[PDB]
From Swiss-Prot:
Family: Belongs to the NRAMP family.
UniProt-recorded name of the protein: Divalent metal cation transporter MntH
Keywords, comma-separated and alphabetical: Cell membrane, Ion transport, Membrane, Symport, Transmembrane, Transmembrane helix, Transport
Superkingdom to which the source organism belongs: Bacteria
Length: 392
């Protein structure tokens, strides 16, 4: 359940934008970022899931009930900015895929995306589970296509091997590496994963809590391992397809279908846009629902779901009216998301290390140290990037 609701967020249009642009512009040199961020997500999402299992509350709820009111207010504001940056990539990714399929302008693609998302808001298991199993099938099959294409493309193994050595090539590579981290370590899922596993116990016992931790850990790592293989394959295929060939608009999502042309042939254009649309519509609905859970946990109240859906569409329509490139703003949103990670990490690392919160399920001291090292690494990368974007 939670590991699957997770996995669909790790294959949103934000991942497509950063993987294709990462491989086309920098070859295989950013393969280590995908591997590092995926292993970071395994640790962080396991802690978030263990927080809801052990304590019975989600991370926003614990912040609201334990921290001072002004700090809860600041944490709610930054979490809403994370929610809008999350939905900005997924809503535009669906509107872009509409243009790839029908040829409509981006504004009309967003109007269609707006009507669909409002319609998708009103639903239930009688209608969601088919639509959710469908979007899961299209996105996973395309993921398998990249797993197959990465072998058929015959990538330069000397360049692939060197790509797993941590190496940054100027500020442009740091900008895209931070976007890859934000697209994999998503703060909105950090808050959401605790709510997905709360209230799932059956006998209210430590032994029952330990099992759900053991079960969730296997489901998360297996799902994260599959998502990591696909993202590495998609970047490696994008490198074998565009890197060094000096193709115009290489790395853009409008020509990303050419990565699967030697495999899918003429159908690569439709099958990629259908996957991009299904990935965008499902994740944008999931993010909207998680945004209401985050607000309810921080503030105790919420705004109507139609108003939240209306407010988050404003940055999408503004970007389209400005004529900005969709693939560029999808990557920018993932970069902003990476700046929301350390804010989500600090309460997670603190709450999961307390006995009055976790009970007998206190996080092992080694994994708490590993989590703080992950927080310092991300803070250093986000400070290094900010340093490059200001001046010397
Ligand atoms: C196998 C898991 C390793 C972690 C992910 C692999 C990519 C980043 C780390 C590379 C080597 C560690 C750093 C060595 C050079 C400094
Ligand atoms: C997307 C995340 C990227 C990282 C973004 C980090 C910066 C956060 C941005 C704005 C915070 C500004 C809002 C200031 C917080 C107001 C809280 C406050 O002081 O209000 C007092 C309270 O109302 C009395 O109880
Ligand atoms: C995706 C990142 C933003 C890009 C959007 C650009 C176009 C919209 C302009 C500003 C939106 C910022 C307003 C949202 C502020 C956080 C939500 C909030 O809670 O409002 C704080 C208020 O002060 C509570 O009292
Ligand atoms: C950068 C490297 C990151 C790659 C991560 C995944 C690695 C391999 C994909 C495994 C998927 C197994 C399917 C492979 C497709 C296949 O079997 O190839 C057919 C053969 O080449 C002719 O028929
Ligand atoms: C078709 C391929 C599927 C995608 C690549 C799959 C695995 C690559 C394995 C990692 C790279 C291994 C090759 C390393 C290399 O060639 O150089 C040796 C290295 O420098 C001295 O340790
Ligand atoms: C699960 C198993 C994981 C083991 C490690 C995966 C590494 C495989 C390296 C070999 C890559 C296979 C394709 C490379 C073929 C090659 O290098 O040359 C063939 C030439 O291109 C055509 O004649
Ligand atoms: C391999 C890394 C994950 C193993 C660490 C699990 C752990 O530290 O504790 C297990 C706990 O008992 C679960 O019920
Ligand atoms: C996403 C988590 C599961 C994905 C697992 C992917 C395995 C690739 C690991 C190391 C590549 C080894 C490359 C070593 C070559 C370096 C020497 C040049
Ligand atoms: C059997 C179930 C039916 C499967 C139906 C779904 C798969 C789509 C199949 C063919 C689409 C062919 C139409 C596009 C023709 C290819 C043209 C091309 O070369 O690429 C696209 C073009 O470049 C863009 O600008
Ligand atoms: C400034 C950012 C945008 C904010 C500006 C708002 C835009 C409102 C436009 C159309 C209303 C949509 C129709 C909604 C119909 C309301 C139905 C209703 O009365 O119930 C909901 C009520 O608000 C509680 O339950
Ligand atoms: C630059 C952002 C880096 C890390 C986020 C900093 C965390 C934001 C503030 C942490 C709140 C806190 O530390 O509160 C702990 C204590 O239990 C309540 O008083
Ligand atoms: C700054 C980087 C790492 C330090 C992380 C801050 C320390 C977080 C650990 C706090 C804790 O859990 O307890 C420590 C001590 O026993 C009572 O504060
Ligand atoms: C770059 C640094 C990344 C390092 C990559 C390491 C790979 C480990 C990944 C997942 C293990 C699962 C996370 C285990 C942490 C939570 C388990 C735990 O601590 O559980 C304690 C409690 O007692 C429960 O019963
Ligand atoms: C990067 C990982 C650096 C710390 C490695 C570790 O696991 O340390 C455990 C700790 O020393 C046990 O209390
Ligand atoms: C800069 C180099 C290292 C930063 C700090 C390295 C990370 C050390 C922080 C580990 C920590 O906070 O210790 C938690 C422990 O469990 C107490 O509760
Ligand atoms: C907001 C997401 C994380 C951004 C954190 C960078 C902002 C740097 C400023 C203060 C942090 C404390 C000093 C850290 C600066 C070291 C990295 C340069
Ligand atoms: Cl090369
Ligand atoms: Na574009």
């Amino acid at each position: 359940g939670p590991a699957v609701i997770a996995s669909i967020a790790y294959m949103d249009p934000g991942n497509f934008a950063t993987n294709i642009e990462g491989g086309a512009r920098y070859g295989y040199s950013l393969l280590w970022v995908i591997l590092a961020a995926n292993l970071m997500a395994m640790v962080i999402q396991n802690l978030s899931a263990n927080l809801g299992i052990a304590s019975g509350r989600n991370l926003p709820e614990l912040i609201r009930e334990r921290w001072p009111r002004p700090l809860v207010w600041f944490y709610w504001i930054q979490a809403e900015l994370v929610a809008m940056a999350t939905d900005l990539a997924e809503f535009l990714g669906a509107a872009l895929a509409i243009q790839l399929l029908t040829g409509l302008p981006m504004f009309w693609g967003a109007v269609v995306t707006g009507v669909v998302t409002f319609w998708l808001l009103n639903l239930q298991k009688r209608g969601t589970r088919p639509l959710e199993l469908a979007v899961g099938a299209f996105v996973l099959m395309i993921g398998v296509a990249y797993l197959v294409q990465v072998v058929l493309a015959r990538p330069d193994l000397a360049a692939v091997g060197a790509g797993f050595v941590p190496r940054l090539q100027g500020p442009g590579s740091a900008y895209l590496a931070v976007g890859i981290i934000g697209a994999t370590v998503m703060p909105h899922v950090i808050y959401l994963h605790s709510a997905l596993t709360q209230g799932r116990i059956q006998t209210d016992t430590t032994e029952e809590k330990r099992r759900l931790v053991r079960l969730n850990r296997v489901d998360v790592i297996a799902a994260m391992g599959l998502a990591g293989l696909i993202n590495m394959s998609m970047l490696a295929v994008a490198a074998a397809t565009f890197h060094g060939k000096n193709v115009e608009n290489a790395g853009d999502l409008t020509t990303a279908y050419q990565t699967l042309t030697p495999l899918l042939g003429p159908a690569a254009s439709v099958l990629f846009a259908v996957a991009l649309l299904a990935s965008g519509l499902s994740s944008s609905a999931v993010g909207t629902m998680a945004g209401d859970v985050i607000m309810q946990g921080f503030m105790g109240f919420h705004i109507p779901l139609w108003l939240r859906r209306l407010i988050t569409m404003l940055p999408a329509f503004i970007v389209i009216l400005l004529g900005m490139d969709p693939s560029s703003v999808l990557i920018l949103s993932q970069v902003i998301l990476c700046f929301g990670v350390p804010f989500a990490l600090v309460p997670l690392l603190l709450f999961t290390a307390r006995r009055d919160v976790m009970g007998a399920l206190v996080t092992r001291r080694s994994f708490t140290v590993i989590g703080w090292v992950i927080a310092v690494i991300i803070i250093a990368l986000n400070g290094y990037l900010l340093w490059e974007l200001l001046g010397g």
